[PDB]
Symmetry: C4
Subunit: 388 residues, 4 copies
């Protein structure tokens, strides 16, 4: 017997530390590795796992040509041991998906898997390996979800879902799902948030989600959610913005609205509220998906004149390609430890990655209440060595 | 301790949804994948699994040349994680077989494995990994079985077996097997059914099997069976036929006899009785093994003037190759969920598949009481990229 | 908790049936498969396993050239799922060995592993993964053992071991080992047996071993052993001999001495006593390692004028290569089922196998009290397709 | 429930015996095997495991070129089944590391993983898969650790760590870690030891560590440690030295100070105290990393005029390449069995290994209270067959 996961507080932390790294592109030089993108990490009672949307092809084969394409019937959510490259001999196929979320509720895994036509997609809910429920596209425009782990509290899992156009008004919802059965949903209030997608969520008593506004906000939209309802919404107050593209530091403090500058197209990212402060992941570049750093902004969670970047950890240099990033948690004793992954995209459309495919490797970091050192942990592939 | 599976009713459902897809041919471009055909799916308490008849060769190697051939000593029933491509690093070999069935009784797996000479084949019964019993060919003409999962009720498993010619009178039996020991068999009554093979079965209180008449019936033969005996037999009443080849819709309503038109050679397929209605899988083409759709026919299970196709889901376009299809079930709480797989055959003798081998990938769908979206989930291989 | 295996009788049987087949050479065409020889099978509570002496090289690579060689430091006993080809992604390395035996005592696995110099080899005893004891070569001439499964009764395992020359007088012993600790050994009486090696053993209340005389006996030497001592010895009385080479049928009935004809070099083989009768495996050829058949000889276990071959099953045609064969058992309820494997050697020095390496595949059969069909289950490799 | 490992005495032993060997370089000829170095072995309740620092590349691929380099962001501690070659289909990635230690406390695994910049590295402590603590470089000069298994007593694990220059005064510490949390550390006393790194440790009631002085000592520094503190320190008294390089036998008896001759650069090695005697591993060559032998020196642990090499086992000939070696233990009933591994380095900078990469295979031996035979168990690769 295992109990459902509880509403634990986030553990104390003062810096982030290198955890697992798969080096998947380097290891894929001889065409062993499955083409992926939109990876993430999620853990059960016994293991943390890598997840990613595979492309139904091996890296460097003819079928990998053109895998920049976002949605195909040949994409599946796959799972593989954390920090290992995904290969045919180690992967598990979770469901057919070109958008996904996964989370463990203390007893079983839940997955949310979108596939099908852009104008008529459906999300399949998997629980304990069984398809238990589904969501039918209601705006008929690329029904989609987090691309990182959802969160579960006392047996009820919470997941953010979007249907509708990019860079215009769309529908944003949270779904509450228990043992694979949809209990209810809520349309996210639009009093503050104007656009939300690709939420990166964690638990600190309640579920916090920090997401991607691909329309008018260079600042990130966020929600606080419990097992019953959405409790609060906003944009991250920090005058230092964390989407990509975005304005140079310092920019506007916008707690209640999109920054109305450099709003599109954005990238999936994450942050962690800490007291009145906030930690924010972001690309080093303000324009492109290169580099990765994480900053701590004093009073960055609140309306304040005192925002300052107290800490900056540079984890992937600006000379290296990054991509999506997302939060995951690991249960410590009586608190949840904040961790995150960074997708390191290689191939199209990256400048000078002269290959026909698009894929990624993974690197991960976890938070400790200790002072970190410094380093650089990029993809590390010599793109010239690779099968094109 | 685990109890034997019970005689549960089928769960309510109103459409089918994409589950797992292996993309095995695409992933086999670099010769990692085992050549297979006649795949199916079956689940135990903890996992669903892919099964298939391997050909003792890797796809695209010289030994894969000529694998259109149905029966060789080098064919084995293999098992691999559901939705994964079968590779040497992930497969398990269950038994030597060129025809098979597998099912889990709640405690252990049973398999039925035919191999040997066409005129002197034997079926090996495996239970919990041990060879426990066997069936000796009695008509001496390709003793053979379902090529999809059998069914077990309160510890007694039921499996359909045929011995004798194709497109002429043969012998059809059901065998009852408990803990791997043959309890009894029955010759299927020929009052209605004139030919039966390759049964696709599921549980809805009793076992229902919908099978393949390769002789005079474009409609599918069926049986209702319990833990002791065959209870009913017939052909599916639906005036919309579901074998391949078959007449164009609408055709004859034949509840009690073969349609006596477009009877051969047929293809393995499946259906689900639902009240007085019936769901039927079928190729899109009325002549060839291309496309896959599933229809719901109002009152299609009974003798009625009111048959109509209330629903048609097109899951694989007619421009794509299909093949065999079969039912499997997944235990929900107090009901069994209806699912099915579709074999996507590539290679010989398919027109324009210019390779020397014959193999397949898999796609699967499960039934939910929700409205589906729409999509297309074909093999997806560019046959031109493949090692011939 | 699991009890130690008990002294069960052999189950009734009247023929042998195809079980698992790995097709390892066919599947090794693309250099994925580990080079092996001297395979065997042994089972624990939950699985049967393939074992073999690997050669520390992949089939078809430059390091596989010359693997006809019997003993090197690069040979390890490896284990892989039964009926699968041994590959880097599925194998386990048990110990360094160029001669081995393995058996499961009901709780844990024991292995006996010989390696080192011909004139100073030692056998390592492994129990539950730990090296627990050892045997030092005492005749200083290729200390060696069964190359098939040993047997364990009420926690005491029995294994036959030889040290000394081939085709001359050597030392033969049985060792009793409990939880990996050597309890005692006995020098095999030489009142009847003149040479013994490579014993194939099973349990029928007591342990029976049928072995290889590589000196003067075309008939096979045998022993009956319990948890304490050797109880009986002899040669198989059957006037139909079962070593290779051997005289044509019928030959001499020699219950108490080597036949004194066609004695060398012999091949590992097996048999099963059944009442006063005996089942004997043997190559089809009387001179070479080609084909495989199993015969039942009426009264073949005893001194009698009534020996006759009541049954002959031809399992591998004489046009196909065979090799070693050995017994293993599978617990049925209150009896042990007799099974056997056949090593199918390909490569050097086989005539017309034009490659530089030597390896093998595996096929297995189990006994049932049912009438068998007929078939042929050879290696199946087109040696011309293989990397040399 | 499993108890924490106890302070057991070392088991009696009088020689070492071949255990597991992976033949990883031979098996890597077709580019399947992960490039590694600094391997070791450590066991839990159910299995012994191989560990090594991978290089984020497959052997023989372009990314393997230049892997002589010691520290990169693409190095991870990986785990794979003992005696198997590390491949993508069997490995687990434990953490990002270019220096590591691992040990099992009876309940869970702990790992210590150093990565990042040379002048600002940090060690991540992993316990039960979760990052639980860390050590920040304090001398800012390649914070580093054992490269073999740590040891745990009654739930408290002990690990030796160094920060500072090579061939000059550095800082050496022991850390005590419980359930992944650092309890305390101690600076190693410098009353006797002048330099310590790469400790090879085992348990004999207390923890004994025999390490590498890379400065002034051709004799090896050692410590005796319990769950609370460092109890004793010294250099191995044996007038026969065991670092590499070192003086020819016999050299100085230096129980309390470095030999002050042939002190650098040294190699990781191990030994076992036995009564007043000591067993010492060492390369056969006194100058290079070739060959491997283990000696027993009578009274070699103490100050005595009676040191003599009572036993010499030559396990890898001087014509073969060796490398690092380290101790590990296996629980026997009420004692710990002493075992060790030897890293067999191939590639740069080894003379005549004409390839661009640097990697290794593994061989292992365990101690028994029996007389051994003799043999030779080198890497066995024909470097000429390998992809460069
Ligand atoms: C949602 O969970 C609560 C229990 O969790 C607490 O309340 C949540 C709203 C949130 O604030 C958490 O952080 C809190 O820890 C459930 O409330 C329980 O309901 C049962 C049955 O009525 C009752 O016996 C308990 O006393 C309640 N527990 C508490 C602490 O109030 C609530 O039922 C959950 N809602 C759903 C829809 O599952
Ligand atoms: C990646 O693929 C492109 C496109 O390939 C073509 O279209 C595909 C859908 C498929 O049908 C292929 O068979 C086609 O070749 C390649 O670009 C083509 O290259 C060919 C051969 O040099 C050239 O004749 C065409 O004009 C190109 N077509 C286009 C639209 O650019 C490209 O070479 C592939 N990249 C790699 C690294 O192989
Ligand atoms: C077959 O199973 C029945 C129990 O299942 C019920 O009866 C079947 C025929 C079928 O209609 C199912 O859907 C039903 O749920 C067994 O009947 C039991 O037998 C035992 C022993 O005699 C008796 O104690 C119980 O009362 C019976 N149970 C019921 C509900 O009647 C029957 O034994 C099974 N037959 C075989 C050969 O195994
Ligand atoms: C697939 O195999 C066929 C047949 O191969 C021949 O017969 C086999 C049983 C085996 O013995 C092979 O060695 C033989 O080559 C191939 O067709 C043959 O191709 C060869 C060479 O071009 C030609 O000389 C023969 O006439 C052909 N034989 C026949 C009966 O057609 C075919 O090329 C193979 N396909 C692929 C993609 O390689
Ligand atoms: C060997 O096993 C016997 C028990 O097995 C029986 O005797 C064997 C010799 C063999 O004939 C088997 O087939 C039989 O089933 C052990 O005898 C037991 O010893 C214990 C302790 O003295 C005693 O309490 C039991 O009564 C004995 N059991 C019987 C049936 O006699 C014997 O100890 C074993 N010897 C060793 C060395 O382990
Ligand atoms: C299998 O190997 C033999 C022998 O290889 C030679 O000796 C080995 C130990 C090793 O040192 C190799 O590098 C040597 O090549 C091969 O036979 C040799 O082939 C070469 C090249 O054609 C020839 O010059 C030598 O005379 C041969 N030596 C002998 C003793 O025959 C043989 O070709 C290999 N087989 C295959 C299929 O590659
Ligand atoms: C360290 O372990 C001891 C128990 O182990 C013994 O003492 C060690 C110092 C070492 O000498 C071992 O080989 C010995 O076996 C712990 O001592 C126990 O402490 C508890 C709580 O105070 C007490 O109830 C027991 O009586 C003590 N046991 C003994 C045998 O003295 C000690 O607590 C451990 N220290 C730490 C920091 O964990
Ligand atoms: C191993 O690599 C070296 C170096 O490769 C060069 O530098 C690397 C960092 C990378 O940028 C590569 O693309 C470069 O080629 C190889 O040595 C080079 O070989 C090339 C081609 O022959 C030659 O023109 C350069 O002068 C060489 N550079 C140096 C510094 O020596 C070497 O060939 C590789 N080894 C193998 C076995 O391939
Ligand atoms: C469902 C879907 O296709 N989501 C997209 C996504 C999307 O286009 C934008 O967020 C706008 O809505 O962006 C990104 C892109 O890297 O920005 C990759 C995704 N790829 C996949 N999830 N497959
Ligand atoms: C035992 C056997 O060989 N069964 C056949 C089968 C058969 O020929 C017909 O159903 C007529 O009886 O049809 C099909 C074919 O795709 O229609 C493939 C099978 N291949 C295998 N099961 N191996
Ligand atoms: C230890 C050893 O090398 N045993 C031999 C063996 C042996 O030479 C004879 O039985 C004579 O004693 O025969 C055979 C051979 O196939 O006949 C293969 C073996 N190969 C291995 N077991 N590695
Ligand atoms: C952390 C680190 O880089 N340690 C080194 C090491 C080191 O340079 C010396 O011991 C001197 O301090 O020596 C050796 C070398 O083989 O002697 C390999 C190591 N490689 C790795 N552990 N990655
Ligand atoms: Ca934005
Ligand atoms: Ca038909
Ligand atoms: Ca003989
Ligand atoms: Ca491969
Ligand atoms: Ca030194």
């Amino acid at each position: 017997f295992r109990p459902f996961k509880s509403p634990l507080p986030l553990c104390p932390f003062r810096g982030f530390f290198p955890f697992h790294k798969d080096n998947a592109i380097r290891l894929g030089e001889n065409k062993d590795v499955i083409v992926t993108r939109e990876p993430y990490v999620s853990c059960d009672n016994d293991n943390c796992w890598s997840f990613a949307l595979a492309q139904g092809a091996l890296l460097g084969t003819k079928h990998s040509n053109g895998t920049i394409k976002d949605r195909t019937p040949y994409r599946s959510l796959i799972r593989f041991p954390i920090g290992t490259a995904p290969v045919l001999g180690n992967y598990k196929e979770i469901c057919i998906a070109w958008s996904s979320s996964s989370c463990f509720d203390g007893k079983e895994w839940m997955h949310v898997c979108m596939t099908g036509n852009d104008n008529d997609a459906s999300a399949q809910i998997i629980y304990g390996g069984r398809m238990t429920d589904s969501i039918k596209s209601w705006r008929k425009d690329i029904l989609r979800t987090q691309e990182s782990e959802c969160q579960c509290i006392d047996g009820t899992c919470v997941v953010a879902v979007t249907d509708g156009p990019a860079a215009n008004s769309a529908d944003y919802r949270v779904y509450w799902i228990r043992e694979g059965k949809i209990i209810k949903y809520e349309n996210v209030p639009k009093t503050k948030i104007q656009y939300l997608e690709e939420c990166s969520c964690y638990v600190d008593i309640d579920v916090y989600c920090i997401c991607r506004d691909n329309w008018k906000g260079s600042n990130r939209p966020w929600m606080r959610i419990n097992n019953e309802t959405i409790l609060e919404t906003g944009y991250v107050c920090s005058k230092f913005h964390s989407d990509t593209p975005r304005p140079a530091d310092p920019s506007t403090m916008s707690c209640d609205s999109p920054s109305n500058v450099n709003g599109g197209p954005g990238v999936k990212g994450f942050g962690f509220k800490a007291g009145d402060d906030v930690w924010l992941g972001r690309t080093v570049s303000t324009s492109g998906r290169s580099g990765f750093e994480i900053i701590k902004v004093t009073e960055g969670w609140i309306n304040s004149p005192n925002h300052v970047k107290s800490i900056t950890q540079t984890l992937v240099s600006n000379n290296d390609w990054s991509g999506y990033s997302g939060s995951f948690i690991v249960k410590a004793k009586d608190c949840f430890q904040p961790c995150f992954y960074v997708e390191l995209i290689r191939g199209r459309p990256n400048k000078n990655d002269d290959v026909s495919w698009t894929s990624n490797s993974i690197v991960t970091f976890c938070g400790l209440d200790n002072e970190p050192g410094s380093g650089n942990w990029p993809d590390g592939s010599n793109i010239g060595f690779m099968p094109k």
